[PDB]
Amino acid sequence: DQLTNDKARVEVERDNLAEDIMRLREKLQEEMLQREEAENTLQSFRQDVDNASLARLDLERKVESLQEEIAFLKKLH
Amino acid sequence: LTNDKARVEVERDNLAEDIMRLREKLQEEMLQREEAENTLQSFRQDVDNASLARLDLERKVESLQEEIAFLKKLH
Amino acid sequence: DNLAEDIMRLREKLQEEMLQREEAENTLQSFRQDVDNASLARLDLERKVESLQEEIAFLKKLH
Numbered sequence: 001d002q003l004t005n006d007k008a009r010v011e012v013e014r015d016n017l018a019e020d021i022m023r024l025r026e027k028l029q030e031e032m033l034q035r036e037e038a039e040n041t042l043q044s045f046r047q048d049v050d051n052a053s054l055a056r057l058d059l060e061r062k063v064e065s066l067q068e069e070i071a072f073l074k075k076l077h
Numbered sequence: 078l079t080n081d082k083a084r085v086e087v088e089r090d091n092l093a094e095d096i097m098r099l100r101e102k103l104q105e106e107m108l109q110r111e112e113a114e115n116t117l118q119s120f121r122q123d124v125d126n127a128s129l130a131r132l133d134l135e136r137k138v139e140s141l142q143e144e145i146a147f148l149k150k151l152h
Numbered sequence: 153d154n155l156a157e158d159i160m161r162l163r164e165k166l167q168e169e170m171l172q173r174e175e176a177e178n179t180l181q182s183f184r185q186d187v188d189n190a191s192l193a194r195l196d197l198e199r200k201v202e203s204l205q206e207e208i209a210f211l212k213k214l215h
Protein backbone atom coordinates (compact mmCIF):
# COMPACT_ATOMS: atom_id res chain seq x y z
CA ASP A 1 0.00 0.00 0.00
CA GLN A 2 1.05 3.60 -0.64
CA LEU A 3 0.46 4.42 3.04
CA THR A 4 3.19 2.11 4.36
CA ASN A 5 5.57 3.30 1.64
CA ASP A 6 4.96 6.94 2.54
CA LYS A 7 5.44 6.17 6.24
CA ALA A 8 8.71 4.36 5.56
CA ARG A 9 9.82 7.21 3.29
CA VAL A 10 9.16 9.82 5.99
CA GLU A 11 11.08 7.73 8.52
CA VAL A 12 13.95 7.47 6.02
CA GLU A 13 13.99 11.26 5.61
CA ARG A 14 14.11 11.68 9.39
CA ASP A 15 17.02 9.21 9.47
CA ASN A 16 18.75 11.25 6.76
CA LEU A 17 18.49 14.47 8.75
CA ALA A 18 19.74 12.76 11.92
CA GLU A 19 22.62 11.13 10.04
CA ASP A 20 23.54 14.47 8.46
CA ILE A 21 23.74 16.03 11.91
CA MET A 22 25.87 13.12 13.10
CA ARG A 23 28.23 13.56 10.18
CA LEU A 24 28.67 17.23 11.10
CA ARG A 25 29.21 16.42 14.76
CA GLU A 26 31.89 13.81 14.06
CA LYS A 27 33.78 16.00 11.58
CA LEU A 28 33.62 18.83 14.12
CA GLN A 29 35.16 16.50 16.71
CA GLU A 30 37.95 15.57 14.30
CA GLU A 31 38.65 19.29 13.98
CA MET A 32 38.68 19.49 17.79
CA LEU A 33 41.32 16.76 18.12
CA GLN A 34 43.54 18.16 15.37
CA ARG A 35 43.26 21.58 17.02
CA GLU A 36 44.36 20.10 20.34
CA GLU A 37 47.42 18.39 18.84
CA ALA A 38 48.31 21.64 17.06
CA GLU A 39 48.07 23.48 20.38
CA ASN A 40 50.39 20.99 22.09
CA THR A 41 52.99 21.20 19.33
CA LEU A 42 52.78 25.00 19.37
CA GLN A 43 53.38 25.03 23.13
CA SER A 44 56.45 22.84 22.69
CA PHE A 45 57.65 25.43 20.18
CA ARG A 46 56.98 28.11 22.80
CA GLN A 47 59.21 26.32 25.31
CA ASP A 48 61.97 25.91 22.71
CA VAL A 49 61.78 29.61 21.83
CA ASP A 50 61.99 30.67 25.49
CA ASN A 51 65.06 28.49 26.08
CA ALA A 52 66.61 29.94 22.92
CA SER A 53 65.92 33.39 24.37
CA LEU A 54 67.82 32.48 27.54
CA ALA A 55 70.81 31.10 25.62
CA ARG A 56 70.79 34.14 23.32
CA LEU A 57 70.79 36.41 26.38
CA ASP A 58 73.86 34.63 27.76
CA LEU A 59 75.65 34.90 24.41
CA GLU A 60 74.79 38.61 24.29
CA ARG A 61 76.32 39.15 27.73
CA LYS A 62 79.47 37.29 26.63
CA VAL A 63 79.63 39.38 23.45
CA GLU A 64 79.31 42.58 25.50
CA SER A 65 82.23 41.51 27.70
CA LEU A 66 84.30 40.67 24.62
CA GLN A 67 83.40 44.09 23.22
CA GLU A 68 84.75 45.77 26.34
CA GLU A 69 87.98 43.74 26.24
CA ILE A 70 88.49 44.41 22.52
CA ALA A 71 87.81 48.10 23.17
CA PHE A 72 90.55 48.23 25.79
CA LEU A 73 93.00 46.28 23.61
CA LYS A 74 92.34 48.78 20.83
CA LYS A 75 92.92 51.62 23.29
CA LEU A 76 96.33 50.10 24.03
CA HIS A 77 97.41 50.11 20.37
CA LEU B 78 -4.95 10.53 15.12
CA THR B 79 -3.41 13.06 17.51
CA ASN B 80 -0.79 10.43 18.36
CA ASP B 81 0.56 10.87 14.83
CA LYS B 82 1.09 14.56 15.58
CA ALA B 83 2.65 13.71 18.95
CA ARG B 84 5.22 11.38 17.36
CA VAL B 85 6.18 14.04 14.82
CA GLU B 86 6.57 16.54 17.65
CA VAL B 87 8.84 14.10 19.50
CA GLU B 88 11.04 13.49 16.44
CA ARG B 89 11.30 17.21 15.68
CA ASP B 90 12.14 17.89 19.33
CA ASN B 91 14.96 15.33 19.31
CA LEU B 92 16.34 16.66 16.02
CA ALA B 93 16.13 20.16 17.50
CA GLU B 94 18.15 19.06 20.53
CA ASP B 95 20.78 17.50 18.25
CA ILE B 96 20.96 20.73 16.25
CA MET B 97 21.38 22.71 19.47
CA ARG B 98 24.24 20.57 20.73
CA LEU B 99 25.89 20.82 17.31
CA ARG B 100 25.60 24.62 17.39
CA GLU B 101 27.01 24.85 20.92
CA LYS B 102 29.99 22.61 20.13
CA LEU B 103 30.59 24.59 16.93
CA GLN B 104 30.65 27.85 18.91
CA GLU B 105 33.12 26.39 21.41
CA GLU B 106 35.28 25.20 18.50
CA MET B 107 35.25 28.75 17.11
CA LEU B 108 36.29 30.14 20.50
CA GLN B 109 39.20 27.70 20.77
CA ARG B 110 40.08 28.63 17.19
CA GLU B 111 40.28 32.29 18.21
CA GLU B 112 42.54 31.29 21.10
CA ALA B 113 44.83 29.30 18.79
CA GLU B 114 44.94 32.23 16.37
CA ASN B 115 46.03 34.74 19.02
CA THR B 116 48.62 32.31 20.39
CA LEU B 117 49.87 31.84 16.83
CA GLN B 118 50.30 35.57 16.18
CA SER B 119 52.06 35.99 19.52
CA PHE B 120 54.42 33.15 18.66
CA ARG B 121 55.13 34.76 15.29
CA GLN B 122 56.02 38.03 17.03
CA ASP B 123 58.36 36.12 19.36
CA VAL B 124 60.04 34.37 16.42
CA ASP B 125 60.52 37.64 14.52
CA ASN B 126 62.00 39.36 17.58
CA ALA B 127 64.35 36.43 18.20
CA SER B 128 65.53 36.40 14.58
CA LEU B 129 66.17 40.14 14.63
CA ALA B 130 68.07 39.88 17.91
CA ARG B 131 70.35 37.09 16.70
CA LEU B 132 70.87 38.95 13.42
CA ASP B 133 72.19 41.89 15.42
CA LEU B 134 74.23 39.40 17.45
CA GLU B 135 75.65 37.90 14.25
CA ARG B 136 76.75 41.32 13.00
CA LYS B 137 78.30 42.10 16.38
CA VAL B 138 80.19 38.79 16.35
CA GLU B 139 81.45 39.50 12.82
CA SER B 140 82.67 42.96 13.85
CA LEU B 141 84.42 41.39 16.84
CA GLN B 142 86.14 38.87 14.55
CA GLU B 143 87.30 41.68 12.27
CA GLU B 144 88.70 43.72 15.17
CA ILE B 145 90.42 40.59 16.50
CA ALA B 146 92.09 39.89 13.15
CA PHE B 147 93.14 43.53 12.95
CA LEU B 148 94.72 43.41 16.41
CA LYS B 149 96.48 40.13 15.61
CA LYS B 150 97.95 41.69 12.47
CA LEU B 151 99.76 44.17 14.74
CA HIS B 152 101.69 41.26 16.27
CA ASP C 153 11.91 23.67 7.23
CA ASN C 154 14.35 25.43 9.55
CA LEU C 155 16.20 22.14 10.01
CA ALA C 156 17.25 21.26 6.46
CA GLU C 157 18.53 24.81 6.06
CA ASP C 158 20.14 25.43 9.45
CA ILE C 159 21.91 22.15 8.68
CA MET C 160 23.36 23.41 5.40
CA ARG C 161 24.36 26.65 7.13
CA LEU C 162 26.18 24.86 9.96
CA ARG C 163 27.78 22.64 7.31
CA GLU C 164 29.15 25.63 5.39
CA LYS C 165 30.40 27.29 8.58
CA LEU C 166 32.03 24.01 9.59
CA GLN C 167 33.80 23.80 6.22
CA GLU C 168 35.10 27.33 6.73
CA GLU C 169 36.40 26.29 10.15
CA MET C 170 38.14 23.28 8.59
CA LEU C 171 39.90 25.46 6.01
CA GLN C 172 40.90 27.85 8.79
CA ARG C 173 42.43 24.99 10.78
CA GLU C 174 44.31 23.82 7.68
CA GLU C 175 45.85 27.27 7.21
CA ALA C 176 46.70 27.24 10.92
CA GLU C 177 48.60 23.94 10.79
CA ASN C 178 50.45 25.16 7.69
CA THR C 179 51.58 28.21 9.67
CA LEU C 180 52.58 25.85 12.50
CA GLN C 181 54.80 23.80 10.16
CA SER C 182 56.44 27.00 8.92
CA PHE C 183 57.09 27.81 12.58
CA ARG C 184 58.71 24.39 13.00
CA GLN C 185 61.15 25.10 10.17
CA ASP C 186 61.86 28.49 11.76
CA VAL C 187 62.67 26.80 15.07
CA ASP C 188 65.07 24.36 13.40
CA ASN C 189 66.91 27.13 11.55
CA ALA C 190 67.07 29.19 14.75
CA SER C 191 68.67 26.25 16.57
CA LEU C 192 71.30 25.85 13.84
CA ALA C 193 72.19 29.55 13.83
CA ARG C 194 72.26 29.55 17.64
CA LEU C 195 74.76 26.69 17.84
CA ASP C 196 76.86 28.32 15.13
CA LEU C 197 76.99 31.62 17.03
CA GLU C 198 77.86 29.74 20.24
CA ARG C 199 80.90 28.20 18.55
CA LYS C 200 81.83 31.61 17.10
CA VAL C 201 81.68 33.20 20.57
CA GLU C 202 83.86 30.41 21.97
CA SER C 203 86.45 31.07 19.25
CA LEU C 204 86.27 34.80 19.99
CA GLN C 205 86.95 34.14 23.66
CA GLU C 206 89.95 32.01 22.70
CA GLU C 207 91.44 34.67 20.43
CA ILE C 208 90.81 37.30 23.10
CA ALA C 209 92.68 35.09 25.56
CA PHE C 210 95.52 34.96 23.02
CA LEU C 211 95.68 38.74 22.65
CA LYS C 212 95.66 39.05 26.44
CA LYS C 213 98.53 36.55 26.58
CA LEU C 214 100.45 38.82 24.21
CA HIS C 215 100.31 41.44 26.97
Ligand SMILES: [Cl-]
Nearest residue numbers: 056059194197
Ligand atom coordinates in the same frame (compact mmCIF):
# COMPACT_ATOMS: atom_id res chain seq x y z
CL1 LIG D 1 71.95 32.89 19.95
